[PDB]
Every structure is written in structure tokens, then in C-alpha cells.
């Protein structure tokens, strides 16, 4: 009877090259069917973010579905989440066209810095451990080399009594995305804070020279391309402060 | 026996004004029991985003739970989302504290412009049925007036053959999420697009904007960064597709 698309959308990182897409025939199927497709551009275009492709889908007697990898074009550049479209057409004389014969394909980037934070905003532990590896997690990207100031604080707890006054800076290299602050430390429960400061790209990140040279230009005089470069750079997140509770 | 927050986690629209926080008694409810708490600063602050409260709850023998209100400060300025913190203390001897004895609280800024985008990347439309109400959403915010360019594109469906003209711009006033684009029809398909959202030369923060937009990004302080972000944008879908 008809012949369509299943699944409907495809969400895919820019960094996996080959990726499959799945076509479907329906109703009766005893005969040799067929249909064709074309990779139409969106905010992703053949040549820049995916390599445009056209082809022919043959559904011999018996088979009722077809597959085919499409390719995504990797790069070191920071962009945003774009779409390109694939479109069905020319179904042979038996088979008609049903929903959906146009497929939406999102390309998630990964060349962003980007966002830095803690797991929870309160952590527990006794007081006979006696070091706690607090994790600062890197999300949404790993691109570049980034510093991550950090420091502790007293609350129900005081340095050199409940814990050890700890201060420093975490250095997230390129493709790394989790670092651990090292934290050294009958009833009695107290707690101290611990913050992560303003993430900053480091001089060696292969994009750092470029960035502080644009910040020369007034907001006003920024291209789209230039505008986005500035959207790439790293930042904290919802959890820039944590708490560490110490019972016994 | 023990006391804690429940929920130990709260989310809030900065425009709500207030909301209730909740504590709880576990062991022996047959006795009177007290407890304190005090708001303490996080990403937020007790004069730009809400009000400060250290206070006193009473758990008369019989009640095993308590509730109180915290007030959110509303404003015009777009900020990012900000977890602030409430924490209990000074329990009555009988009782001990427990998790979550630190309620974390987030403030959801309502002051973005905000983010526009079609509802779907493909819309289906039946044979002989006239007009369709296409929607442009405005997620994340709706702070001030935003102008929204649209139009139409010849495809397999041709303008003035399958569909037609349709080209203008939508003016989302202040507190408005959605506005429609209008499409006029008579196997194939055409796509519709939205453009590059722009504020209006009157939206209270606009001189204030193109003023700072004069600065070298460099000398752009910190609140200039955040102010800046608040300007309207497009979400995921900026092309629709109409199937006939
Ligand atoms: Ca692109
Ligand atoms: Ca891309
Ligand atoms: Ca990449
Ligand atoms: Ca990219
Ligand atoms: Ca604030
Ligand atoms: Ca606020
Ligand atoms: Ca507000
Ligand atoms: Ca606000």
C-alpha cells in the first residue's frame, strides 16, 4: 500500500561520521518495490556540516524496509544545534506516500567549552574517611583547555578543625570532562561550602589567541560567525557552590 | 526522633511572589518540638531576588510537619537562573536534623525576550481545506516587545499555484508567547520560515541596550553580559514544512 519513514527525527553529534536512516514499506509487500531520497539543506548544509547525498531505495519482493548511513562533517569550530532535511519521492506505481516522507535531522555540536558545575549541591560523609573527592563535572562539551578556580569556606565547619583549608584551580584539558577537587578532613554534624569560580579558557587552547582579539570589537561590530565564537566560551552552571556535611 | 525538609528542593518563577517551604518530624510526635532555619545566600541575594528570613516553627504534640512562605523579589532585569539556599538549625534537644536539612531553591527568571521557534518541523494539511493557523512560539521568556520576520518559499508547491504570498512580520507585544502566521492554499509541499527576532525601539531596555552595545566586548563588564543575553532569539525550529 504505502511507504514512509520510521524513526521520524534523528539527533546526532557532529562527531560520529556515519549514521543510519530507516525507510518502511507497508500493506502488501510480495513484489519488487522502490523509492528515492534527497538530502536537502537546513541550517546545516551539504559541504559544511553534512555531505549531501542522493540515492535510490530498492524494495525487492519480501523485504519491507531499507537502511542507509548519512555522513556528518566533523570540525573544530563551535556552532550551534542545526537541522538538515531528507526527502522521499518517486514511489513506484503500487506504493503511495504517507507521513512522514520528510525527515528532520538535528546536528548537536561538541566544540563548545563549555559549562562547568557540581553534581549535587549538598554532599554527606562521616568524619573518619578522611579525604573526599568532590567532582566538578564538565557538560555539553570538552573543547579547549579550561582553568576552574576553586576555594573552600566555613559554615557549621571551620578550617584546620573540621577540614583543611583548600584552594586551587582545576585544569580541564581538551577531551576531559571531570576533575576531582581533593578535600582533606560521639554525635556531631557540621559542614563547609566549596565553590567553583569563573571558568576560563587557557592560553594554550587552540582558540584562545582568536578570542580575546574579538573582544576588542564593540558588541555592535560583530559578525554572526564572530558572534558565535563568543557563544562557544566556557561558563559555570546551576551548581557553582556545593555543601559538604560531616557527621561522625 | 528527627527533622528535615520535604521537599528539600524548590523551583520558582521569579514572578510568583512567594511559595511555601516544608519541614517534617519523624520519631516522637507526642511531644512539643521546635527548630530554626535561616535563609543563606547562593547565586541569589536577599534584596535583588527575595527577602531574608531566619525564623521559628512550632511542632505542637500532634503535628509532624510544618510550612512557611518565602517571598520572591520581582523586577524588570533579565537574570540567569539562581539556586539560593535555606537551612535549618538549633533543633530542640529531643530531636536531630537530617536530609534534606538544607533546602536548595532555584529562581526562574521570567525576564527573557524570549526564544521564538515553530512548533514542529513538518505540518500536515488536508486536500481541500482553505487556511491553516501556523504558530510562532516564544519560549523561555516574553519580556518586552519583539518583532519577528517571516515569509514563504517556492518549493514543490509553488506560490500562487499550491500556496501563496504570505510575507510580513509578527509583533509580539509584552506578555505574549504565541502569535500566528497565516497561510493560503488552493502530493507536494512548501516551507515557511521565521527570521531573526528583534526587540522594538521602545522596549524599555533598548536604548539601555544599543547604548552598551557600543562598548568593546572587552570593556563590557559583567551585568552588561547578562543584560545582553536577554535579547530575543530563535529556538530549534525556524523552518516549517506544509504537506498537501
Ligand atoms: Ca553550519
Ligand atoms: Ca555542525
Ligand atoms: Ca566537532
Ligand atoms: Ca561544529
Ligand atoms: Ca541576582
Ligand atoms: Ca531574581
Ligand atoms: Ca521579573
Ligand atoms: Ca529577574
Explained architecture:
Two copies of one chain form a homodimer. With 248 residues, the first copy, chain A, is mainly β. The first copy, chain A, has two domains: 1-113, Immunoglobulin-like, CATH 2.60.40.2030; 114-248, CalX-beta domain (Immunoglobulin-like). Chain A has two helices and 20 strands. Chain A has helices at residues 208-214, 224-232; strands spanning 2-5, 9-13, 18-19, 22-25, 33-40, 54-59, 65-67, 70-71, 82-89, 96-97, 102-108, 115-118, 123-125, 131-139, 146-153, 167-172, 178-184, 190-196, 200-201, 241-246. In chain A, strands 13, 15, 16, 18, 19 and 20 form a six-stranded mixed beta sheet that branches. Chain A has a five-stranded mixed beta sheet with strand order 2-11-9-5-6, with no helix packed on it. The longest helix of chain A is centred in the last third of the chain and has 9 residues, at 224-232. The interface between A and B is medium-sized, with 34 and 34 residues. Bound molecules: calcium ion (8 copies). One calcium ion binds next to loops of chain B. The PDB classes it as metal binding protein. Keywords: calcium binding domain, calcium binding, metal binding protein. It forms a dimeric assembly. Crystal structure of CBD12 from CALX1.2. Chains A, B are Na/Ca exchange protein. Organism of A, B: Drosophila melanogaster.
Computed CA radius of gyration of chain A, to the nearest angstrom: 26 Å
CATH superfamily of the largest domain in chain A: CalX-beta domain
Which band does the percent of strand residues of chain A land in?
Answer: 35-45%
Give the helices and strands of chain A as they follow along the chain: EEEEEEEEEEEEEEEEEEEHHE
* Principal-axis shape of chain A: elongated
Distinct ligands, ions and cofactors found in the model: calcium ion
Structural class of chain A: mainly beta
Protein chains sharing the most extensive interface:
A-B, 34 and 34 residues
| Count of helical stretches of chain A | 2
- What's the multimeric state? homodimer
CATH architecture of the largest domain in chain A: Sandwich
CATH secondary-structure class of the largest domain in chain A: Mainly Beta
Protein name (chain A): Sodium/calcium exchanger Calx
Subcellular location (chain A): Cell membrane; Cell projection, Rhabdomere membrane
Binding site for Ca(2+) 2 (chain A): 14, 49, 79
Binding site for Ca(2+) 1 (chain A): 14, 49, 79, 82
Amino acid at each position: 500500500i504505502r511507504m514512509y519513514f520510521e524513526p521520524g527525527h534523528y539527533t546526532v553529534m557532529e562527531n560520529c561520521g556515519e549514521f543510519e536512516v530507516r525507510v518502511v514499506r507497508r500493506g502488501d509487500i510480495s513484489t519488487y518495490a522502490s523509492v528515492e531520497y534527497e538530502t536537502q539543506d537546513g541550517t546545516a548544509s551539504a559541504g559544511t556540516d553534512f555531505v549531501g547525498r542522493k540515492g535510490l531505495l530498492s524494495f525487492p519482493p519480501g523485504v519491507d524496509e531499507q537502511r542507509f548511513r548519512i555522513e556528518v562533517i566533523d570540525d573544530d569550530v563551535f556552532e550551534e544545534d542545526e537541522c538538515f532535511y531528507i526527502r522521499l519521492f518517486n514511489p513506484s506505481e503500487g506504493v503511495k506516500l504517507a507521513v512522514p516522507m520528510i525527515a528532520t535531522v538535528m546536528i548537536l555540536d561538541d566544540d563548545h567549552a563549555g559549562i562547568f558545575a557540581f553534581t549535587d549541591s549538598v554532599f554527606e560523609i562521616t568524619e573518619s574517611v578522611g579525604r573526599f573527592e568532590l567532582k566538578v563535572m564538565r557538560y555539553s562539551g570538552a573543547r579547549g583547555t579550561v582553568i576552574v578556580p576553586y576555594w573552600t569556606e566555613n559554615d557549621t565547619a571551620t578550617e584546620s578543625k573540621d577540614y583543611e583549608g583548600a584552594r586551587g584551580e582545576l585544569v580541564f584539558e581538551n577531551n576531559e570532562s571531570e576533575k576531582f577537587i581533593d578535600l582533606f578532613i560521639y554525635e556531631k554534624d557540621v559542614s563547609f561550602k566549596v565553590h567553583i569560580g569563573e571558568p576560563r579558557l587557557a592560553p594554550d587552547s587552540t582558540h584562545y589567541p582568536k578570542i580575546k582579539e574579538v573582544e576588542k570589537k564593540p558588541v555592535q561590530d560583530l559578525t554572526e560567525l564572530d558572534r558565535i565564537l563568543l557563544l562557544s566560551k566556557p561558563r559555570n552552571g546551576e551548581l557553582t557552590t556545593a555543601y559538604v556535611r560531616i557527621r561522625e
